[PDB]
Amino acid sequence: TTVSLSAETLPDVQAGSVVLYRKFEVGEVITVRPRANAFDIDLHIKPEYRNLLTSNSVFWAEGGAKVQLNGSGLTVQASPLSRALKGAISFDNLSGASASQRKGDKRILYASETAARAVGGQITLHAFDAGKLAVGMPIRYLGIDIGQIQTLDLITARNEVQAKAVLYPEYVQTFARGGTRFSVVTPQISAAGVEHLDTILQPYINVEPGRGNPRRDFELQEATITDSRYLDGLSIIVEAPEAGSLGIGTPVLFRGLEVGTVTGMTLGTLSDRVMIAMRISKRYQHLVRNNSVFWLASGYSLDFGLTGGVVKTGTFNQFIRGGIAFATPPGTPLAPKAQEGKHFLLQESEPKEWREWGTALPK
Amino acid sequence: TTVSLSAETLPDVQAGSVVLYRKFEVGEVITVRPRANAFDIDLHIKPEYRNLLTSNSVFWAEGGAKVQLNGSGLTVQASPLSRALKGAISFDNLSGASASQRKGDKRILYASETAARAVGGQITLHAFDAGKLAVGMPIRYLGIDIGQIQTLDLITARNEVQAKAVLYPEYVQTFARGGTRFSVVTPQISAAGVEHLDTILQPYINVEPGRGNPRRDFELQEATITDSRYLDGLSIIVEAPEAGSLGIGTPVLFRGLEVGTVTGMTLGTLSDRVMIAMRISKRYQHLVRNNSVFWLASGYSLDFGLTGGVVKTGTFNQFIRGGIAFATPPGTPLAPKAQEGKHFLLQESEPKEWREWGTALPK
């Protein structure tokens, strides 16, 4: 016996199994020494490698012939029978696993490789409905996998679901800094068209980063659409009497070109006006001014003629998601740029002069 | 022979098979001693572990090489040939299995691990149609698996299907308290759009908890939509001459923002008015008052013009699910909050002054 182990549950571990290292075989498991409360596992490694063995090492266990799918994959490694018959143990060093050996007496055998990387990077979410969440669900940023949900805990004292997820140690300091918005993505089949196609197969969690204190306690927000594409933009609040056909994902239009989208919809402080939160992209941030009137351009408007009736149908997005359109009135002194927070007043009718304005906006 | 067993049916059990413990091998099955009415099974365990053996232990049997799917999973454990050739027996302790040994002479071998946890947590449902139910169908609360249907019994004396399901022992006391609404979920493809996407693959049973006496005898209600999202809200009853386009899932609107949904539709006590049951969310509970007139806002309304005709089409939800909209008339003494049960009278026309009311509702 060269290095011992401890664990609470031993589903896979079988005596006589082979010790792996980077999916390569060195060492041997010899003894499962049982206890009533917490079982003990003993390992043999060679006398040269135990000098190479570091106190910053973690041991993770896996067992059985695993065919992994992982999209379009089936391959099984060059494997001995000792994994095929008995539950194996692999190991590797990492940087900051010294704290797991400072606490307790001996090392712990993690149930898989995922729980072996769950030191320091483990965060906790709070969701009202775990109908979209799943164990093994990846947390993605810009479509790059930076984390994974590993468990789901239901609480009936406070009726909500605590999902504890992990982050990889490169991104544990960059993310989880407070003001971080975790949001699931999901397919939508409704009056609003769908943009997410892969989420029918495998849903993930989009994330917005933030800056501040390392909180590591988060709330899962609703399924948001604006956050993924239109980011780090100029946030504009517009007040309206009605909602109308507006919604999350409704485009903001300038001469028919989509310059931004609506982030969210909320009642006002006093319940007389709804506020519609939108973001304009950085390339189009300079377009809005302090004198930039909005108007609701939602759905089809056509004029009847008595002698003869001229009609036109664009089949545009504002039928499905009724957009807000704007233009700047002409002024030879130009009003300054819009601030990070500014309240606009929506006009109910489209002002007729908007074709003939022609306000020069440079850069 | 160290511990014996009894069972009625013996599909899997084969003599010479290995005894498991937490999917780890200790002990050995030696003898299948037959009888005409109820067969006897005998087990060998080591003399150290039989002192460790507790009277609160259950034995469950499983047999054959089982590849489990469980979503995106295929893995087979580190297994001996003794499971691969012969039907094995695993065991574990639990808290309150002493009552199974108080009754009868010896322990019973359950047919699987699911029936071994079916002590005390076993409830009974009564459904009119078992077309949605299935054996192994999970009972979920907030998307967390808290139970499982294990059998289906058809009765032709009273033409209905008794489905006996289990609950895990953490949730047997919290749930099954009477006033508990069990409801299946199912995909819908109709005039009303679908919200449930996973239920095409695997349907489950949503559940509302209750408080009272431990009944453990329940009735399976219809497929409800309002219960999952809008919960613990202010229940409001509105009386109308017609149903119209209303239904379960029809949103309640305040200035175009969805504040609540319709729970169910029922004829009145005297068959002259239908009552429409709705719930308003806790964040929007303070919006309704004792003077809050409703009106039916269902589908598209547009005005014809003779010289020129102004038309607008929102493509809103009230075409698909015709919503009820409200606003509060102005009064310098404010009427109090709506009670837990209060009957409103629906107005057939939209009152024109509703834009210019502007009633101040604080908090």
List, as one string, the DSSP characters of A46-80. Answer: -HHHHHH--TTEEEEEE-S-----TTT-----S--
C-alpha dist (Å) from residue B49 to B27, B36, B45, B54, B202: 9, 32, 7, 10, 41
CA distance A247 to chain B (A): 10
Which residues have C-beta within 8 Å of that of residue A362, sequence separation ≥ 6?
A: none
Chain B residues touching A303 at Cβ < 8 A: 308-309
Q: Which of B198, B208, B130 is nearest to B164 (CA)?
A: B130
Radius of gyration of chain A (CA): 29
Judge contact between A45 and A19, C-beta under 8 A: yes
Give the chain B residue nearest A81 (alpha carbons).
Answer: B78
Residue B60, CA atoms < 13 Å, CB-side half-sphere: 18
C-alpha dist (Å) from residue A261 to A223, A247, B252: 15, 10, 25
Is A64 part of the contact surface with chain B (CB cutoff 8 Å)?
A: yes
- H-helix or E-strand containing B123? strand B122-127
Judge contact between B19 and B1, C-beta under 8 A: no
Tokens for B84?
């691969």
Cβ distance A85 to B74 less than 8 Å, yes or no, reads: no
Q: Count Cβ–Cβ pairs < 8 Å, chain A vs chain B.
A: 138
Residue bearing tokens 């006391």: B173
C-alpha dist (Å) from residue B128 to B132, B137, B158, B204, B210: 11, 17, 10, 17, 22
Going B244 to B247 to B252 to B257, the CA torsion angle's sign is negative
Strand ranges across the sheet with B220-221 = B122-127, B160-167, B144-155, B138-141, B205-208, B181-184, B220-221
Judge contact between B306 and B299, C-beta under 8 A: no
Question: Between residues 136 and 155 of chain A, which touch chain B (CB distance below 8 Å)?
Answer: 136, 152, 154
Q: How far apart are CA A141 and CA A224, in angstroms?
A: 14
Strand ranges across the sheet with A3-7 = A3-7, A39-44, A25-33, A18-20, A88-93, A57-62, A109-110
| Single-letter residue type at B233 | G
Eight-class DSSP state of B65 = -
Give the chain A residue nearest B228 (alpha carbons).
Answer: A129
Tokens for A67?
């065919």
Residue bearing tokens 């709804």: A274
Radius of gyration of chain B (CA): 29
φ, ψ for residue A4, nearest 5 deg: -100, 170
User: Coil, helix or strand for B227?
Assistant: helix
Q: How far apart are CA A39 and CA A7, in angstroms?
A: 6
Judge contact between B250 and B264, C-beta under 8 A: no
Total residue count of chain A as it appears in this document: 363
CA distance A273 to chain B (A): 8
Total residue count of chain B as it appears in this document: 363
Cβ distance B76 to A64 less than 8 Å, yes or no, reads: yes
Is A16 part of the contact surface with chain B (CB cutoff 8 Å)?
A: no
Q: Is B62 exposed, middle or buried (0-12, 13-18, 19+ CB in 10 A)?
A: middle
φ, ψ for residue A346, nearest 5 deg: -80, 135
Identify how the structure was determined: cryo-EM
Chain B residues touching A87 at Cβ < 8 A: 77-78
φ, ψ for residue B101, nearest 5 deg: -95, -25
Going B312 to B316 to B318 to B319, the CA torsion angle's sign is positive
Q: How far apart are CA B204 and CA B139, in angstroms?
A: 6
Cβ distance A9 to B24 less than 8 Å, yes or no, reads: no
Diameter of chain B measured on Cα atoms: 101
Cβ distance A298 to B309 less than 8 Å, yes or no, reads: no
Is B104 part of the contact surface with chain A (CB cutoff 8 Å)?
A: no
Q: How far apart are CA B311 and CA B304, in angstroms?
A: 7
Of A136, A245, A270, the CB nearest to B314: A245
Eight-class DSSP state of A354 = G
Q: How far apart are CA B78 and CA A89, in angstroms?
A: 12
Helix locations, chain A, DSSP H: 47-52, 81-85, 99-102, 113-116, 226-229, 317-320
B242-253: burial string, b at 16+ Cβ within 10 Å, e else: eebbbbbbbbbb
Which residues have C-beta within 8 Å of that of residue B130, sequence separation ≥ 6?
A: B152, B154, B161, B163
Cβ distance B314 to A301 less than 8 Å, yes or no, reads: no
Q: Which long-range contacts (CB under 8 A, 24 or more apart) does A50-57 make?
A: A50/A2, A50/A3, A53/A3, A54/A93, A55/A98, A55/A101, A56/A93, A56/A94, A56/A95, A56/A96, A56/A97, A56/A98, A57/A91, A57/A92, A57/A93, A57/A94, A57/A97, A57/A107
Give the chain B residue nearest A8 (alpha carbons).
Answer: B22
Q: How far apart are CA A19 and CA A110, in angstroms?
A: 14
Residue bearing tokens 């229940």: B235
Judge contact between A231 and A263, C-beta under 8 A: no
In a mutagenesis test of the A interface, which of B144, B146, B253 is the best target, namely the one with the most A β-carbons within 10 Å?
A: B144
Residue bearing tokens 């022992």: B169
Judge contact between A160 and A127, C-beta under 8 A: yes
Which residues have C-beta within 8 Å of that of residue B45, sequence separation ≥ 6?
A: B2, B3, B19, B26, B27, B53
Task: Quickly list DSSP for B89-114.
Answer: EEEEE-SSTTHHHHSSSS-BEESSHH
Chain B residues touching A264 at Cβ < 8 A: none
Chain B residues touching A10 at Cβ < 8 A: 22, 24
Boundaries of every domain in chain A? 1-119, 120-225, 226-363
Of A69, A131, A303, the CB nearest to B143: A131
User: Coil, helix or strand for B286?
Assistant: helix
Is A264 part of the contact surface with chain B (CB cutoff 8 Å)?
A: no
C-alpha dist (Å) from residue A227 to A211, A223, A278, A279, A282: 17, 10, 11, 9, 14
Cβ distance A63 to B78 less than 8 Å, yes or no, reads: yes
User: To 5 degrees, how large is the angle CA B288–CA B291–CA B294?
Assistant: 70
User: Coil, helix or strand for A286?
Assistant: helix
Interstrand relation of A181-184 and B18-20 (parallel, antiparallel or unpaired): unpaired
A163 phi-psi bin (left φ>0, alpha ψ -120 to 50, beta other): beta
C-alpha dist (Å) from residue B120 to A143, A200, A326, B97, B244: 47, 39, 66, 9, 47
Which residues have C-beta within 8 Å of that of residue A67, sequence separation ≥ 6?
A: A74, A76, B74
Residue bearing tokens 């070109």: A257
Of B22, B197, B257, the CB nearest to A187: B197
Is A156 part of the contact surface with chain B (CB cutoff 8 Å)?
A: yes
Where chain B is broken, by preceding residue (C–N > 2.5 Å)? none
Is B191 part of the contact surface with chain A (CB cutoff 8 Å)?
A: no
Residue A249, CA atoms < 13 Å, CB-side half-sphere: 15
Q: How far apart are CA B227 and CA B206, in angstroms?
A: 9
Give the chain A residue nearest B79 (alpha carbons).
Answer: A85
CA distance B268 to chain A (A): 33
Q: Which of A178, A116, A179, A114 is nearest to A147 (CA)?
A: A114
Chain B residues touching A265 at Cβ < 8 A: 257
Residue bearing tokens 């029936």: B115
Which residues have C-beta within 8 Å of that of residue A167, sequence separation ≥ 6?
A: A121, A122, A123, A139, A146, A147, A175, A176
Of A66, A130, A320, the CB nearest to B142: A130
> To the nearest 10°, the Cα dihedral for B167, B173, B179, B181?
-30
- HEC profile of B127-185: ECCCCCCCCCCEEEECCEEEEEEEEEEEECCCCEEEEEEEECCCCCCCCCCCCCEEEEC
Chain B residues touching A32 at Cβ < 8 A: 24
Is B310 part of the contact surface with chain A (CB cutoff 8 Å)?
A: yes
Tokens for B57?
């232990």
Diameter of chain A measured on Cα atoms: 101
Chain B residues touching A320 at Cβ < 8 A: 315
Cβ distance A86 to B78 less than 8 Å, yes or no, reads: yes
Is B77 part of the contact surface with chain A (CB cutoff 8 Å)?
A: yes
Resolution in A: 3.6
φ, ψ for residue A125, nearest 5 deg: -105, 165
